[PDB]
Design a protein around this ligand. Structure first.
Ligand SMILES: Nc1nc2c(ncn2[C@@H]2O[C@H](COP(=O)(O)OP(=O)(O)OP(=O)(O)O)[C@@H](O)[C@H]2O)c(=O)[nH]1
Ligand SMILES: Nc1nc2c(ncn2[C@@H]2O[C@H](COP(=O)(O)OP(=O)(O)O)[C@@H](O)[C@H]2O)c(=O)[nH]1
Ligand SMILES: Nc1nc2c(ncn2[C@@H]2O[C@H](COP(=O)(O)OP(=O)(O)O)[C@@H](O)[C@H]2O)c(=O)[nH]1
Ligand SMILES: [Mg+2]
Lengths: 52, 436, 50, 49, 50, 426, 426
């Protein structure tokens, strides 16, 4: 039973750390993408008043 | 189902003058030991049998024992209003007072009247069938309540043992000093009671003067004022055994739910709502309000900061209109509250209890009649500060060997002085360890 | 006081994160139910076509 | 005396709110783990569809 | 007899938990790395357009 | 002719059973005096399952009453529907366990088991064909979870073939009402898992949230919690008391709900639950009843049943209805929530129909789901146990009356293995 | 078979919907108690489009109230016919909208819209064969536009196959209620032109001009305006409830009206609208109902069609009439006013006839036009927007709740290109 608990705890901890680090990375990447899409939208709106 | 109360000394008998007034007033017993035939308040005939037994044809006599060495206060209560109430042998008294000395009241004079007191209590207990336990009310700072008080604690323990012991002592307060030599008879009795009596609920004097100043506005209060709310808290903790409710807690629940370790048993008591008639209806009482008032530090019978401590357990009696849902919501809010902390090994720590009967107001008092009332008894580690201050002032006089000649002439020596000093130090160490 | 204020701000940040995660869980549960319904419908369609 | 008493209250408040923040962090982590579990289930059902 | 059968059940449960946990962790990492790969592809496309 | 013996222990069990013998006695149409005053005949046909007719026309329930203080005997006797319990069944101590498992399982429970076993044995032998024993008892006390478990083991020894229904109202994590409730719950669940045929776990936080959400009761009290639990408990046995189209007894429920020996910790629900203000806005239709049943907040356990996967489930419908839509709905539910169902069992749901709906209502239903999401209720109590035992808190009270570390260590180990065996199928 | 769920967003939408439900209950012949007390069976043949049989005739409407205060909800309960809605659908927060787009689309929306979706999804799954959604709101407030528009978006994403009618009370310059009406209108139309399928646009300026000229009222309070908007929304969809000589479903109306997926703003009127005094003298036949229908002063919109061109029109008649008469009416109207019509669409008018006239009236008609002159409202609102967006006035109440300048510029550009799309075809 001690072996049981040790192994299961190890698996739980590794899942915890993977999920947390991955979530942080995705949040950073999504922030970058949001900045980029705001830039593209501003470019799209601005080029409306440009002459041919 | 009866509980037998012993009152020892000046403070014991004054708190008795207040309590045995409140109980008879609530059960509707006339001050002559009878109950009126024409008008009968709503209650069960078994309810009053917890305190006032019947003697023959419509005569009620209390289950209690007042005892003192002086004749002054005892014959004062004899001359008082309650003449035929108390049985003429429920009032035991010597003829020369111990005169503020543990040794004098525990060896020289304490070894004559205790045999008669114990014989009377033994016969009364054998009369009683369902003895829940023994409740003691006394002052640790005096002679008559301390010396033979500890003597009687020891003798009751060796006589019965299996019945619970619940003490209510009046420690010296931090700054207000009634007497001078008080710390001696305080520490000497602490050495004994720390391991004889089962559960001790402590009281103070400034801790109640401040309350009756803020919440009652009696700028010049006295013992006659304080003892009434002392009686009130005693009644509000025995109400579950006395009357019927929804979630009862007998005399064993307090010990089973509030004493983790055998040598960690010291309780802080608090009562809400302390309010006068003027603000009674101008303020809106509710469960959240009364519980938050109880758990704020300034509404405590003992002058101490729980914010220097970590609550270990708490017991909440509720009276009157109490739905078992609002209490749960309020205690959940308390657990969520960001000020009072808990020791990490106590997930569940709130033993609640409810009774239908709301509190009863004594006429001529300052407390107003209210729909409900709580009573919180907590085992917390902040009480160690009290004993730390007691030692910090005890050594200052012990080092000088001052005021010791009285005790040494009576017969005790400084060996037990050092023993009490070391054991209270160990008790402080134990609170420090349990604080982990 | 500065420390207490900073800790408070972290507390509200974590609470907001919790609420957002719960909302996402609700949305994903709804999508679970919808997808399983589509599974059943297309299984019936497969049997009919066979 | 007034300042030091207030300081003690502030320290008690700070340690308890730090405990609360740690509890919140644990809860957020558990929610994230439940979240990607649910996402796994969704993706598997989508593959079956 | 109770403790013997409990021992056997414990062994079987140990094997089952090992397999389930390893498979679940592997699968979830694969799924979420595919997700982040899609996100970085989107970022690269945005950068190229800009 | 298939007899149910009802056993009530402690204050909580006694109040729950008081509401039970209110509801079921009303259903069979007896007055509070004890004389039948119904109108139909189907309700008279099966008085024997819950009554023993006696000369003079005073029916009396077959319910044993056990506790350790008359303060609960009188509270359950003086109340309404109280003057019909047989006085001979009133077996009681007058000491009080006091929230302690030891005092109610090794000394005072030990000395009262003799009399309570005598009462239960005369009750069992006074009825021809037993059907089962069902015990409604708390798990946070010491006179319901200390003596109740000992009585359960005794009954298992004396009748090792009868179904057992343990209505166990386990404690709550947030709703703290005692300090040693983890002890008195774990130590009793340890000895219940081995000797209980089926365990209906209950709680009070779930009952409060139901009486907030659905019934919208502003001030829900125990007089409402116990009323709802009485409704569920009187609905659990509809076939043994009334006719129908597809009957289901306790044995049927056990066979269709228990795929493994140790795995019989069910979770329970009742329908329809609706407020008095909205009693006349909604429709009592089988789709609505089933939609309410198959929710997560409609259940009577703090565990969110939407975490794990239902190993199996049982529904007891009562009312003149159509088995076609009964089965169609309770198969569409599997087709639409197959994720929350374990795969290696086809038709996880067993549905049964009784003809006569209960009094007042028109079409009722009871839900009994054997799911693996019930692990989260025991994991928290195990966590509390480990937290308290890591510091040996309150241990002197237990060890001063015969208890040893053997019981505590075994309880820890078996709680852990039980939560593991639930977690296995996930 | 076909049915429509209804949602009442904000105070304006709630009161309009309350009057609409009073009108529908009157037309179908039911009491405020919920019972049916009509006269004919043609009305109860098809009440399932808007109502559900609860229990023995207590018909319950299929609508959901929605706001952020309890005062309006209490008012609608206390008002007549307010005792029929399901209390489970009175979803409402407590904090207060603050007439703020951010406060109704980003905080209180995020805190109540999961619940509003839960209840509307429950209703939409209770109903079997959905046909569309109906929503009533105003485009000048915070929770009128925020709450309602976010609900529109979520419902469109969740059921993207159901025709959607959103009835929008656009702000009018002369009746200037608050200070941020242009901001809210811009941020609301930005999402409506992208997600919702058609909005019928109305305005208080024309709703007052109609009451002053045609009705000849003296003191028209909001009761009469809501009455007119009701009588329009009741006749917008009558081919469902009642048979007709030439039926027209909602989807048929949409496909005939909307030529391009981004030109779906409908300007609507009703006939006959006769003053209480001159009605006794007036004559009511088709070739004057049509004349008042195309009368530019009967339009519930401050955009005179003589300032633009008609892309498509829809005339829904009610009563037993002559179809050839109706068709010749439309043809000669087109030939008379060829200039006001677009060249590349032959027969710009779609006509429909229903066989049951409203309560009391013997003939009725409703006009729904897609004229390109409706660009005037958007042009004016955009001018009022850019009058404030140059100086960032009243903008910190949205900046602090978390909206940048990028979405404001997006919404303004959306309005500008919408105006361009109307103007180009003309
Ligand atoms: N709060 C409170 N304290 C009391 C009351 N009566 C007595 N005391 C306490 O009694 C102490 C005085 O010493 P005593 O307790 O009277 O001494 P004793 O027990 O009578 O023994 P002797 O000194 O020999 O008379 C004071 O410090 C008080 O705290 C009372 O009514 N209320
Ligand atoms: N639902 C319900 N719960 C109750 C009732 N009475 C008590 N309880 C709960 O049951 C728990 C355990 O009660 P218990 O200690 O066994 O009462 P005892 O029989 O006197 O020992 C307590 O926390 C109560 O909150 C009741 O009538 N209904
Ligand atoms: N037709 C009609 N319009 C109304 C009524 N009451 C208010 N309004 C209009 O609704 C606008 C108020 O917007 P409001 O609903 O408070 O915005 P919200 O708080 O975001 O929903 C005002 O400009 C009024 O002209 C009514 O009874 N009938
Ligand atoms: Mg004295």
């Amino acid at each position: 039973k001690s072996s049981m608990d040790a192994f299961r705890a190890g698996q739980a901890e590794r899942l915890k750390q993977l999920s947390l680090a991955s979530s942080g990375a995705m949040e950073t990447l999504r922030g970058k993408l949001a900045v980029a899409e705001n830039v593209l939208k501003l470019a799209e709106l601005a080029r409306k008043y440009e002459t041919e | 189902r009866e509980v037998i109360s012993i009152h020892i000394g000046q403070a014991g008998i004054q708190v008795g003058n207040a309590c045995w007034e409140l109980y008879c007033l609530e059960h509707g017993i006339q001050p002559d030991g009878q109950m009126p035939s024409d008008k009968t308040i709503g209650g069960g005939d078994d309810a009053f049998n917890t305190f006032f037994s019947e003697t023959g044809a419509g005569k009620h006599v209390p289950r209690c024992i007042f005892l003192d060495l002086e004749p002054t206060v005892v014959d004062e209560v004899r001359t008082g209003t309650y003449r035929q109430l108390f049985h003429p042998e429920q009032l035991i008294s010597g003829k020369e007072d111990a005169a503020n000395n543990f040794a004098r009241g525990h060896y020289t004079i304490g070894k004559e009247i205790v045999d008669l007191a114990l014989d009377r209590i033994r016969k009364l207990a054998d009369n009683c069938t369902g003895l829940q336990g023994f409740l003691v009310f006394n002052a640790v700072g005096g002679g008559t309540g301390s010396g033979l008080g500890s003597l009687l604690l020891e003798r009751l323990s060796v006589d019965y043992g299996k019945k619970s012991k619940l003490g209510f002592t009046v420690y010296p307060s931090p700054q207000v000093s009634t007497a001078v030599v008080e710390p001696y008879n305080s520490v000497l009795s602490t050495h004994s009671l720390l391991e004889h009596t089962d559960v001790a609920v402590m009281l103070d004097n400034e801790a109640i003067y401040d309350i009756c100043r803020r919440s009652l506005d009696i700028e010049r209060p006295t013992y006659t004022n304080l003892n009434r709310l002392i009686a009130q808290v005693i009644s509000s903790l025995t109400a579950s055994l006395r009357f019927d409710g929804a979630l009862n807690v007998d005399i064993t629940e307090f010990q089973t739910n509030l004493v983790p370790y055998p040598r960690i048993h010291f309780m802080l008591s608090s009562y809400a709502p302390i309010i006068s008639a003027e603000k009674a209806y101008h303020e809106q009482l509710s469960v959240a309000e009364i519980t938050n008032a109880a758990f704020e530090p300034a509404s405590m019978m003992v002058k101490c900061d729980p914010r220097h401590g970590k609550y270990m357990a708490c017991c909440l009696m509720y009276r009157g209109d109490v739905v078992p849902k609002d209490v749960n919501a309020s205690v959940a809010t308390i657990k969520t509250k960001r000020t009072i902390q808990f020791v990490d090994w106590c997930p569940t720590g709130f033993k609640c209890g409810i009774n239908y009967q709301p509190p009863t107001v004594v006429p001529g008092g300052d407390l107003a009649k209210v729909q409900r009332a709580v009573c919180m008894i907590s085992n917390s580690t902040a009480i160690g500060e009290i004993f730390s201050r007691l030692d910090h002032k005890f050594d200052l006089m012990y080092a000088k060997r001052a005021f010791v000649h009285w005790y040494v002439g009576e017969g005790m020596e400084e060996g037990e002085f050092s023993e009490a000093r070391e054991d209270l130090a160990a008790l402080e160490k134990d609170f420090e360890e349990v604080g982990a | 006081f500065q420390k207490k204020r900073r800790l408070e701000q972290q507390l509200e940040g974590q609470g907001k994160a919790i609420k957002g995660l719960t909302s996402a869980m609700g949305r994903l549960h709804v999508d679970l139910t919808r997808v399983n319904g589509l599974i059943a419908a297309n299984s019936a369609a497969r049997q009919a076509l066979a | 005396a007034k300042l030091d008493e207030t300081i003690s209250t502030l320290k008690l408040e700070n340690d308890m709110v730090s405990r609360q923040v740690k509890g919140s962090v644990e809860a957020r982590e558990k929610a994230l783990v439940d979240h990607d579990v649910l996402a796994l289930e969704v993706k598997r059902l989508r593959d079956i569809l | 007899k109770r403790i013997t059968e409990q021992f056997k059940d414990l062994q079987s449960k140990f094997r089952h938990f090992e397999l389930v946990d390893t498979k679940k962790y592997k699968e979830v990492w694969g799924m979420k790395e595919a997700d982040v790969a899609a996100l970085v592809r989107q970022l690269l496309q945005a950068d190229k357009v800009l | 002719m298939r007899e149910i013996v009802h056993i009530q222990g402690g204050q909580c069990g006694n109040q729950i059973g008081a509401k039970f013998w209110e509801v079921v006695s009303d259903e069979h149409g007896i007055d509070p005096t004890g004389t039948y005053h119904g109108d139909s005949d189907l309700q008279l046909e099966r008085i024997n399952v819950y009554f023993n007719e006696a000369t003079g026309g005073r029916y009396v329930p077959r319910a044993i009453l056990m506790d350790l203080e008359p303060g609960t005997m009188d509270s359950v006797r003086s109340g309404p529907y109280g003057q019909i319990f047989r006085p001979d069944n009133f077996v009681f101590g007058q000491t009080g366990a006091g929230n302690n498992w030891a005092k109610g399982h090794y000394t005072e429970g030990a000395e009262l088991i003799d009399s309570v076993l005598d009462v239960v044995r005369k009750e069992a032998e006074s009825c021809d064909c037993l059907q089962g024993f069902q015990v409604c008892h708390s798990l946070g006390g010491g006179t319901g979870s200390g003596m109740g478990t000992l009585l359960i083991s005794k009954i298992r020894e004396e009748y090792p073939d009868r179904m057992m229904l343990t209505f166990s109202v386990v404690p709550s994590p947030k709703v703290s009402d005692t300090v040693v409730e983890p002890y008195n719950a774990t130590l009793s669940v340890h000895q219940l898992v081995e000797n209980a045929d089926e365990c209906m776990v209950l709680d009070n936080e779930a009952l409060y949230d139901i009486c907030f959400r659905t019934l919208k009761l502003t001030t829900p009290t125990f007089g409402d919690l116990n009323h709802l639990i009485s409704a569920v408990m009187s609905g659990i046995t509809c076939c043994l008391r009334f006719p129908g189209q597809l009957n289901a007894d306790l044995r049927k429920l056990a066979v269709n709900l228990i795929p493994f020996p140790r795995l019989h910790f069910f979770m329970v629900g009742f329908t329809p639950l609706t407020s008095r203000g909205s009693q006349q806005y909604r429709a009592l239709t089988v789709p609505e009843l089933t939609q309410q049943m198959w929710d997560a907040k409609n259940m009577m356990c703090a565990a969110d049943p939407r975490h794990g996967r239902y190993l199996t489930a049982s529904a007891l419908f009562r009312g003149r209805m159509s088995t076609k839509e009964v089965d169609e709905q309770m198969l569409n539910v599997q087709n639409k929530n197959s994720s929350y169902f374990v795969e290696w069992i086809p038709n996880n749901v067993k549905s049964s129909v009784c003809d006569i709906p209960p009094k007042g209502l028109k079409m009722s239903a009871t839900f009994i789901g054997n799911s693996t999401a019930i692990q989260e209720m025991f994991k928290r109590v195990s966590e509390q146990f480990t937290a308290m035992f890591r510091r040996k808190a309150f241990l002197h009270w237990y060890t001063g009356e015969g208890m040893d570390e053997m019981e505590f260590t075994e309880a820890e180990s078996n709680m852990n293995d039980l939560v593991s065996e639930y977690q296995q199928y996930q």
